[PDB]
């Protein structure tokens, strides 16, 4: 008989294509078996790669020794992973962060340079030039200044934008006006032409993109949501767009995905819907970092990119 | 009586709003009079600011001592200005070049990250994720590597794009694969995911964006035209879009502007039309550089940003 692979991994991802891609990238390494959760051998896996995994993972696969979030963020992992003693790591990848920046830059430009108006006017064959707005005269606020948010803020500042940043904790970023804590929200919001959400989803940030926040922005601000769908209160977005409190939104993430065909966001002239595309670590990067960490673990070494479960 | 201003300027621009803006910025300086060509006193102006001026300017205003192109480019000036002995200068401005880059970056992103597909699918409420394409795996070609083109090429390379550049003359740009001359066109074109036109309009570049050029690109390339409308042969663009030789275009400039409501470009699903907005020097920058050069001239000094009429 064939001996079983030394490494067995369950790949528990909500997007089937993503899970399949990660399984294939892991199976490019000899002596590795990658299984989906429906396979009964999944119950025996010693390692897991996860993106919105089953909240019951630890029941279905009770022998797990290392769990990896298939992304830089961890707010898609269920509460049980945080409460267990299984080591939890994440994917930290230059190409992913660069992608999140690309998306934010497209979206900033769309509004600053009025591509939004151009595309709308194109539908009616209307030719209308608007004033040109220099990057120093477009004030962008980034909420959330961790690995991703801080990177984006710094890169925007490097292109010449006026950039403000907001975090729960102290941050110092060169070229960026940094604000800390809820009390500082009015001052962070009150000068912005554009707001970009990169917060993780927690009990405190749920619903933060709502009327109380939008009413502290200057009229005609734009919103860009790259966090989670639960950050948003949808009725409040649509209400802001209708009064002109918001002039537009670019939205990548929704409570349910695919976004249902009937959701009214799809149809608002001032909304751009993108299909949770802002950025994703590639399968091969995920595979390699997971395997490197498995190997470290098997050799008794300290793991890289360990998740602090109490942060 | 009031003595006439020491400085009298005619502002001959094809866009009335632009001419008006330049007149107002010049009139912010005391002892300056700025006139439109219809004013009979225009015939006496000693200085001119021009953007697609009357081909008869030198007849209507025969005492002109210094003529300024209200832009970095000069291909909108009529042949007579090049054949006369009147000094000719241009506007060189960091904010303008940065704007041309912004436009090119929006357009590169639009295609690389499939915002084009997202916006199209949004019209039908279709949710469709596509593969994510890293900047090093998006090969952008910039044709024209002068002040503007070279800047854009360098800035794109700095963001991590694979960047090629093409010029009539020798150029060396760090991080950019530089090609020279017509003979090198097949090699410059044959690897590109995206092509950006920044050429000036001359007898040799007229009609360069046509079938012979598009057929040397790899199928599914994208086009971005920031040069002049005459660079394009429209039928050939539409034909390329229809076979899939081109996957899309972003077009800022047209033989006639406003682009007529009936032009079929307005209606192609894979075309973006923008209203000659890519970038413009601001009125106050124009005004100040013109006045600085007038003052230099009146003091017998060498002028700045002099146009080489034989280049």
UniProtKB/TrEMBL annotation, chains A, B:
Keywords: NAD, Oxidoreductase
Domain D-isomer specific 2-hydroxyacid dehydrogenase NAD-binding positions: 107-278
InterPro entries, per database record: D-isomer_DH_CS, D-isomer_DH_NAD-bd, NAD(P)-bd_dom_sf
Gene Ontology cellular component annotations, sorted alphabetically: cytosol
One example GO MF annotation: oxidoreductase activity, acting on the CH-OH group of donors, NAD or NADP as acceptor
SUPFAM superfamilies documented for this protein: Formate/glycerate dehydrogenase catalytic domain-like (SSF52283), NAD(P)-binding Rossmann-fold domains (SSF51735)
Regions that span the bilayer: none
PANTHER family reported in the protein's UniProt record: 2-HACID_DH_C DOMAIN-CONTAINING PROTEIN (PTHR43333), D-ISOMER SPECIFIC 2-HYDROXYACID DEHYDROGENASE NAD-BINDING DOMAIN-CONTAINING PROTEIN (PTHR43333:SF1)
Name listed for the protein in its UniProt record: D-isomer specific 2-hydroxyacid dehydrogenase family protein
Organism encoding this protein: Klebsiella variicola (strain 342)
């Amino acid at each position: 008989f064939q001996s079983m692979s030394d490494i067995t991994i369950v790949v528990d991802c909500n997007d089937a294509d993503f899970a399949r891609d990660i399984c294939a990238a892991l199976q490019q390494f000899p002596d590795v078996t990658a299984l989906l959760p429906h396979h009964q051998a999944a119950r025996d896996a010693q390692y897991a790669s996860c993106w919105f995994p089953d909240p019951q993972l630890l029941s279905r696969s009770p022998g797990l020794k290392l769990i990896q979030a298939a992304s830089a963020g961890v707010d898609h992992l269920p509460p049980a992973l945080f409460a267990s003693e299984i080591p939890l790591c994440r994917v930290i990848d230059e190409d992913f962060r660069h992608g999140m920046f690309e998306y934010a830059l497209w979206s900033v430009l769309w509004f600053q340079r009025h591509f939004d108006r151009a595309l709308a006017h194109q539908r009616t064959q209307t030719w209308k030039l608007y004033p040109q707005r220099a990057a120093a005269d477009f004030h962008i606020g980034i909420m959330g200044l961790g690995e991703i948010g801080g990177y984006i803020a710094d890169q925007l500042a490097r292109l010449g934008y006026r950039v403000s940043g907001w975090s729960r904790s102290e941050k110092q970023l060169a070229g960026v006006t940094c604000y800390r804590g809820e009390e500082a929200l009015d001052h962070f919001l009150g000068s912005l032409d554009g707001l970009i959400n990169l917060l993780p989803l927690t009990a405190q940030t749920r619903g933060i993109l709502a009327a109380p926040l939008f009413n502290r922005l200057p009229a005609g601000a734009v919103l860009i949501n790259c966090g989670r769908g639960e950050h948003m209160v949808n009725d409040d977005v649509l209400a802001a767009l209708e009064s002109g409190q918001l002039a537009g939104a670019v939205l990548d993430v929704f409570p349910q995905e695919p976004l249902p065909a009937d959701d009214p966001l799809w149809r608002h002239p001032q909304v751009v819907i993108t299909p949770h595309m802002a950025s994703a670590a590639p399968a091969e990067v995920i595979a390699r970092q997971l395997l490197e960490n498995i190997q470290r673990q098997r050799r008794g070494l300290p793991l890289k990119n360990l998740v602090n479960k109490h942060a």
